[PDB]
């Protein structure tokens, strides 16, 4: 599913991400924009043999099982395919674990490089929330 901007903001808010660990909703929408272009089905292979999955490009080296990443830990206890669903629950629940693990949203390269320190609330402006 390719979400609209405000549609995703609303779904992320319903699933508890607005100000989760102090990160306002615009941070999450901005991260999803530049990780996946709001596309739940996005996948990308990494140099190390892992793959990133879903709207927040969650990586199979630590967070989910894809059956082909040697040494993976599956800390979200889910198949990586669950992160491609039109239902964002699994991606949100796993993202909550990631962002709570010590480095906050710096876990997401696109967030660090394209969202952090910018006017992220622009990503939710004009939305019914």
Swiss-Prot record:
Subcellular location: Secreted
Lineage top rank: taxon: Eukaryota
Annotated PROSITE patterns: GLYCOSYL_HYDROL_F22_1, GLYCOSYL_HYDROL_F22_2
Major localization class: secreted
The protein's enzyme class: hydrolase
Keywords linked to the UniProt accession: Allergen, Antimicrobial, Bacteriolytic enzyme, Disulfide bond, Glycosidase, Hydrolase, Secreted, Signal
Entry's Gene Ontology molecular function annotations: beta-N-acetylglucosaminidase activity; identical protein binding; lysozyme activity
Pfam families: Lys (PF00062)
Catalytic activity from the UniProt record: Hydrolysis of (1->4)-beta-linkages between N-acetylmuramic acid and N-acetyl-D-glucosamine residues in a peptidoglycan and between N-acetyl-D-glucosamine residues in chitodextrins
Gene Ontology cellular component annotations, sorted alphabetically: cytoplasm; endoplasmic reticulum; extracellular space
Disulfide bonds: 6-127, 30-115, 64-80, 76-94
EC number of this enzyme: 3.2.1.17
Residues binding substrate, per UniProt: 101
Tissue specificity field: In the egg white and polymorphonuclear leukocytes.
Residues covered by the C-type lysozyme domain: 1-129
Active site: 35, 52
Further details from the record: Lysozyme C is capable of both hydrolysis and transglycosylation; it also shows a slight esterase activity. It acts rapidly on both peptide-substituted and unsubstituted peptidoglycan, and slowly on chitin oligosaccharides.
Record's subunit section: Monomer.
Function: Lysozymes have primarily a bacteriolytic function; those in tissues and body fluids are associated with the monocyte-macrophage system and enhance the activity of immunoagents. Has bacteriolytic activity against M.luteus.
PANTHER family referenced in this protein's UniProt entry, alphabetically: LYSOZYME C
Family to which the UniProt record says this protein belongs: Belongs to the glycosyl hydrolase 22 family.
Name recorded for this polypeptide: Lysozyme C
UniProt source species: Gallus gallus
